[PDB]
Design a binder for these strands. Structure first.
Lengths: 75, 591, 590
RNA sequence: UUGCU
RNA sequence: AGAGAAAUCAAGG
């Protein structure tokens, strides 16, 4: 069962598997990020030091999900 | 006659269009034709032309169409290039190509009409007949050969298609009278030695040592370097020599090594090679004849410590011990839900059982995290919690021995050390008690040799779920008062009437919820086939009691003894016995 | 127990969910299942006669008995052949529109059923590799076995698969030909179909003793699906079945209309003892034949439905790895026929590692069809009450004029079930003379209050795929419990607190972890729930995605939202998931 | 390596 | 030893 292993899996040295890339540094502030397989930190790093997309693309992804939000807050 | 769903105007329109009578099953075919024309009317309800009686021509797209009804949409093929077709199921659905030509208006109109048309065919029992008209015959799609037929008839007295020649009739059988449950049954109380405490951890007797704030290693190093351990009570089950196993793990963990090498005392503590030793001993002393295995479960009586465990588990504490992040609030319904949970946490948070649940939560989680691989060495799992001020609280340590489990239900050897307040020999016969000195403060340390499976550790790794059941009871009390008073009051604290020591006395709701959680916690940590069987068969007796309170009568079949289904589950479980005695204390007859 | 019996502001019915120890670990079965399997097999032969005579009962092919043979005072395996014809006939006139949808299902859905749905079944014992495999692999090798021996391609329709099964048994000899090139004769292939793979029923609650379940061979699993799907069509349209719907509205309507004036009402709640130890396959094989014959179905439909039950009459139940024998302190496991035991009557029926038996059933083979055999027995002129039943669990509402009339109907209900081989458990059936209290399928009823109590608590831990999927899946599970009534306003809110706090811990968002230490060191503020931020969901917002809802409330600013939603980021690239693709939808390494 | 009240 | 409950674990190589 995947639920009996998530706690152990997340706490492994390299829990996540990511496609090889160069925009993610090997080490950022003394923490080794890569080596593919990376550590659990990498998603947090991307949320602040990652590359930004266009605002139009953001609305495209959050369109069907955004509609159900205003539907709840309009009634 | 004409069906109700078929309009009268359509009925006479097609009356002379085709020789309905001079056909096979003309009546059904006529109604099918009227369906197709009605579909065209719904399509051209507001462009589309009509040739019915190509049969409809769109003017917006200049395309001719011909509506045909097909049993299966997935069996659609281009009928002809002269005229495009829209195929509709008898239930009302349309082909993916149909939705492109039409739109929401026409598609919704055609369906529903075909639904009531499908209701008409069901009502008149013509389901086969319409299909034989919508499409061709289905011929034979399955046959059984001679050889397979002979094999199928070896173990039955009938053919492949059973044709018994008896006349269908329901015989009359003489039954037995139903008897009335005039009194509630009494549950058998087993006799024998008092049941010892047989849970993974200590429960109400659990205590902790306050340590300076820091990490787990710092807390262990603080305790190990300046503590004195000496045995005051030794058990045969847990020899006093296994204290070296704990101190070795305390020293290793204090140095940053949760995993240490084997020592001599590890063989006794973790039962290394015990499988081979007992197998060799059994074979050497084996004599006689092979006999069918007969396993026996020793019956034990209700132990005195169960009642005192309930009292201690309900005792007040200083910290809240239940710190769950508050959810968001957006609506009035959301605010009431969060208020009920917030008040519930206040009622049961500052209790001993809440702190013990946290100890069980942490101990199970840490032990389970070290059972995901195969390890021939010994791992130390500290049970350390932290108060709001940050001081580390050392409940104890769990040592995990060599484990090579293949299935999740196999037992892994454990040596559990816990800090305890009061020692009771008959409550802890298999525990070895050691006196611990920590900065002029006396502490009692227990050691037990236990084996405990991976699956059971996972369930106790989220033992915090035990709070659900008492919360449901508390919520329904408050909501019931809100409904009758037409106003919600989160601070309502009504008095609950209960049978206490055989007498009916009222008791506070807040106190009733506290030791519902205490009882639920004990049932959770002592859950086993005896517990599961006892509670499952106890619900109908509990339901029977509630019927008797409101003057309802309870009746039973001929050989009905509902207490037997419960008595067989009372063997040695302490809380099951404790629950059984509570039932016997309650009145068995209601007037 | 006196603590669970309130006398003021609350009734004992409300506290029925306190009589559940589902918080603790579920029982697990250990070791061999041979004793449990043989005990299941020997019961219908013991119950076939009023006095126990296993030896004579072993020669019975069809378990049809005279009315005087039925055991009133105890379990009575076997059926009455005249009653089944009449009772099924009575079940046909009543609910005739309900069975008209069955004819539509036969004429439309049945030819269109695909055999690929057999891949979603439970663990299947391979007749090729002689070991357990999951269903999709077992189906793949079975289909290739059919294609090579029959020298033709098998159509996607389930009927084509069943036709291949009938055709392959006409062959004198059959081979697999991979390397393995293993070889079966007609009798060896026949034995594979008859074989039932028995196994322990693990993680089962509410029982002191462990039972066993049996699975059918993949060769016959195609036939089993047809009859079960046809049974599901009838049960969804007949008001006496509680299996369909899923929301358990059947008891809700009976609760509402329970109010009667100047009438002796009554509510009988109970279960069936030895439900799978007393039913005869020929009983419900005759019932299906009556249904199809009076409905006008063709002959090939009749033969298709009867085959799965005819194979079950010849079933070869696998005993397992033997009975445990002890000399001293050592244990040895031996087959049934090696040494004397309590099952010596069945030695003559031992065929290799399996055993042949013509009577009795197993729990996990025919659940829906067994329900129909119970519902047809209710259709009598004397039984004027309302009945709801799901396998070995039923509730019946009596509405009579006198108390004696109810008791006559109550006994008639008990005896009519014995005509089809179903025995009420005397110690598990409770009749409350003033109707208004009863239980059925973990639904406790008191007047207008119908309490839905979950048999198993929803898992309040993350699933283990990724933080976005886990949050959506976990909240949806809580939403289901609230919708069905298993949770209420306060319990549902507490469920998130337990789930959210456990969801944060599994992703190292609590306390001081390596993931947490990085954020407070690099000034990365927690903006998502898995990052340690405050939970943004509420009781009324269970169905809303975190990312979309945080944007509306301003929790997620524009800068961070653009980074996490990048489709070209390297991190990533109910049953389904409303989770937007983001940098937190990663995959854990294997 | 080790921090759920 | 112990865990446990109708028979297993206390590795298997």
């Amino acid at each position: 069962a995947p639920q009996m292993r998530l706690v152990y899996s997340v706490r492994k040295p390299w829990p996540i598997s990511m496609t090889p890339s160069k925009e993610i540094p090997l080490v950022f502030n003394g923490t080794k990020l890569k080596d593919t397989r990376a550590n659990i930190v990498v998603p947090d790093y991307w949320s602040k030091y990652g590359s930004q997309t266009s605002l139009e693309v953001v609305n495209a992804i959050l369109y069907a999900e955004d509609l159900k939000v205003q539907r709840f807050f309009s009634t | 006659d004409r069906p109700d769903h078929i309009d009268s105007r359509v009925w006479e329109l097609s009356e002379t269009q085709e020789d309905w009578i001079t056909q096979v099953h003309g009546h059904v075919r006529r109604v099918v034709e009227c369906w197709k024309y009605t579909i065209c009317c719904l399509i051209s309800n507001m462009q589309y032309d009509v040739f019915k009686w190509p049969d409809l021509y769109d003017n917006e797209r200049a395309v001719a169409y011909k509506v045909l009804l097909v049993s299966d949409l997935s069996d659609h093929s281009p009928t002809s290039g002269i005229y495009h077709d829209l195929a509709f199921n008898l239930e009302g659905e349309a082909e993916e190509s149909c939705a492109l030509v039409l739109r929401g208006s026409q598609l919704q109109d055609i369906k529903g009409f075909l639904c009531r048309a499908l209701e008409w065919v069901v009502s008149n029992n013509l389901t086969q007949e319409v299909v034989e008209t919508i499409s061709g015959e289905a011929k034979l799609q399955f046959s059984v050969g001679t050889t397979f037929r002979t094999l199928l008839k070896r173990d039955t007295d009938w053919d492949v298609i059973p044709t018994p020649r008896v006349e269908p009739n329901v015989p009359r059988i003489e039954g037995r009278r139903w008897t009335q449950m005039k009194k509630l049954p009494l549950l058998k109380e087993k006799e024998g030695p008092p049941s010892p405490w047989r849970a993974l951890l200590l429960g109400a007797d659990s205590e902790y040592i306050v340590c300076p704030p820091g990490t787990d290693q710092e807390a262990i190093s603080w305790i190990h370097s300046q503590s004195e351990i000496e045995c005051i009570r030794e058990s045969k089950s847990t020899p006093a020599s296994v204290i070296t196993c704990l101190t070795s793990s305390l020293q290793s963990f204090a140095e940053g090594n949760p995993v240490r090498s084997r020592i001599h005392e590890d063989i006794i503590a973790f039962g290394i090679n015990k499988k081979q030793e007992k197998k060799q001993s059994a074979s050497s002393s084996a004599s006689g004849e092979w006999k069918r295995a007969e396993y026996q479960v020793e019956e034990m009586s209700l132990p005195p410590w169960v009642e005192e465990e309930m009292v201690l588990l309900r005792s007040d504490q200083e910290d809240n011990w239940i710190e769950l992040e508050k959810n968001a609030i957006y609506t009035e319904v959301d605010g009431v839900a969060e208020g009920l949970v917030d008040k519930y946490i206040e009622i049961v948070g500052r209790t001993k059982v809440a702190s013990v649940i946290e100890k069980w939560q942490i101990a199970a989680t840490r032990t389970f995290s070290q059972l995901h691989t195969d390890r021939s060495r010994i791992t130390a799992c500290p049970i350390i919690t932290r108060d709001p001020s940050g001081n580390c609280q050392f409940w104890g340590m769990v040592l995990l021995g060599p484990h090579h489990v293949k299935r999740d239900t196999d037992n892994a050897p454990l040596l559990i050390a816990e800090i305890m307040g009061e020692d009771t020999e008959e409550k802890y016969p298999k525990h070895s008690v050691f006196s611990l000195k920590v900065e002029e403060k006396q502490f009692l340390l227990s050691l037990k040799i236990t084996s405990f499976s991976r699956n059971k550790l996972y369930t106790f790794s989220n033992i915090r779920r035990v709070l659900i059941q008492p919360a449901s009871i508390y919520s329904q009390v408050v909501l019931s008062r809100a409904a009758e008073n037409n106003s919600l009051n989160l601070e309502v604290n009504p008095e609950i009437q209960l049978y206490l020591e055989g007498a009916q006395r009222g008791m506070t709701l807040y106190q009733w919820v506290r030791m519902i959680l205490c009882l639920e916690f004990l049932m959770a940590i002592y859950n086993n086939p005896q517990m599961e069987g006892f509670l499952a068969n106890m619900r109908r007796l509990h339901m029977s009691r509630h019927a008797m309170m409101e003057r309802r009568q309870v009746f039973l079949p001929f050989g009905s003894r509902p207490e037997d289904k419960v008595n067989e589950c009372i063997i040695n479980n302490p809380i099951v016995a404790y629950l059984a005695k509570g039932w016997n204390s309650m009145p068995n007859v209601y007037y | 127990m006196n603590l669970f019996t309130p006398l003021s502001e609350i009734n004992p019915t409300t506290t029925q969910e306190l009589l559940y120890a589902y918080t603790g670990p579920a029982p697990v079965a250990y070791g061999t299942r041979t004793r449990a399997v043989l005990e299941n097999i020997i019961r219908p032969y013991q119950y076939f006669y009023k006095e126990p005579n296993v030896q004579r009962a072993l020669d019975i092919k069809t378990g049809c008995k005279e009315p005087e043979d039925i055991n009133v005072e105890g379990p009575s395996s076997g059926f009455h052949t005249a009653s089944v014809l009449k009772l099924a006939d009575n079940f046909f006139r009543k609910y005739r529109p309900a069975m008209e949808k069955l004819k539509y299902w036969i004429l439309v859905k049945l030819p269109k059923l695909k055999y690929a749905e057999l891949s979603k079944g439970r663990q299947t014992y391979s007749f090729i590799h002689k070991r357990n495999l999951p269903a999709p692999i077992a189906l793949e090798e079975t289909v290739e076995f059919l294609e090579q021996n029959l020298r033709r391609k098998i159509g996607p329709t389930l009927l084509s698969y069943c036709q291949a099964i009938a055709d392959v048994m006409e062959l004198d000899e059959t081979t697999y030909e991979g390397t393995y090139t293993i070889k079966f004769s007609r009798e060896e292939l026949w034995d594979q179909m008859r074989t039932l793979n028995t196994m322990w029923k693990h993680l089962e609650r509410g029982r002191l003793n462990r039972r066993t379940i049996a699975t059918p061979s993949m060769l016959i699993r195609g036939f089993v699906k047809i009859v079960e799907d046809a049974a599901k069509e009838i049960l969804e349209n007949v008001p006496t079945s509680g299996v369909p719907v899923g929301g358990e509205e059947k008891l809700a309507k009976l609760a509402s209309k329970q109010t009667f004036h100047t009438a002796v009402t009554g509510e009988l709640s109970g279960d069936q003892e030895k439900f799978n130890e007393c039913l005869d396959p020929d009983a419900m094989r005759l019932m299906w034949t009556v249904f199809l014959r009076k409905l006008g179905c063709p002959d090939w439909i009749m033969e298709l439905f009867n085959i799965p039950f005819m194979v079950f009459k010849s079933k070869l139940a696998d005993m397992g790895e033997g009975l445990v024998y002890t000399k001293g302190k050592l244990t040895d496991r031996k087959p049934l026929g090696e040494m004397p035991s309590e099952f010596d009557d069945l030695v003559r029926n031992v065929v290799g590692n399996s055993i042949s038996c013509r009577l009795g059933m197993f729990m996990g083979m025919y659940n829906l069809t067994s329900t129909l055999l119970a519902l047809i027995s209710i259709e009598r002129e004397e039984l004027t009450g309302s009945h709801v039943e799901s396998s070995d669990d039923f509730i019946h509402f009596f509405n009579c004029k006198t108390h004696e009339e109810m008791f006559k109907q109550a006994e008639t209900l008990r005896l009519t079930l014995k005509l089809v081989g179903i025995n009420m458990s005397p110690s598990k059936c409770i009749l409350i003379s003033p109707a208004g209290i009863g239980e059925f399928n973990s639904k406790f009823h008191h007047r207008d209050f119908v309490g839905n109590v979950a048999t198993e608590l929803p898992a309040l831990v993350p699933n283990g795929t990724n933080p976005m999927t886990d949050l959506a899946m976990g909240l949806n599970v809580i939403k289901h419990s609230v919708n069905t009534g298993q949770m209420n306003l306060c319990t549902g809110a507490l469920a998130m607190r337990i789930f959210n706090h456990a969801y944060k811990y599994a992703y190292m968002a609590l306390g001081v972890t390596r993931r947490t230490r990085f954020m407070e060191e690099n000034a990365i503020t927690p903006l998502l729930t898995n990052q340690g931020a405050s939970p943004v969901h509420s009781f009324s917002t269970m169905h809303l995605d975190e990312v979309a809802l945080r944007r509306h409330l301003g929790l997620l600013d524009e800068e961070t939202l653009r980074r996490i939603l990048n489709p070209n980021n390297p991190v990533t690239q109910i049953m389904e998931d409303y989770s937007v693709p983001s940098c937190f939808k990663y995959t854990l390494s294997r």
